[PDB]
Amino acid sequence: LKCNKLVPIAYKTCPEGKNLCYKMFMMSDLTIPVKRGCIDVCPKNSLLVKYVCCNTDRCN
């Protein structure tokens, strides 16, 4: 899977073990994010942050 970095411009292949791309949004998601990378299993989301996991190339 191809996951992007903080910016939706540069992205790479989420390596062996991590084939999922997620993007955590602080305060609110409606806005622009705070952090986003790859993962294997989506963590527990919070009320202060929004955990948006995906499995699509360039999802984040």
Q: How far apart are CA 38 and CA 4, in angstroms?
A: 9
Cβ atoms of 49 and 24 within 8 Å: the answer is yes
Residue 47's CB: how many other CB atoms inside 10 A?
5
Q: How far apart are CA 57 and CA 13, in angstroms?
A: 9
CATH superfamily of 1-60: CD59 (2.10.60.10)
Residue 11's CB: how many other CB atoms inside 10 A?
18
Experimentally, the structure was elucidated by: NMR
Name the residue with tokens 């949004």.
25
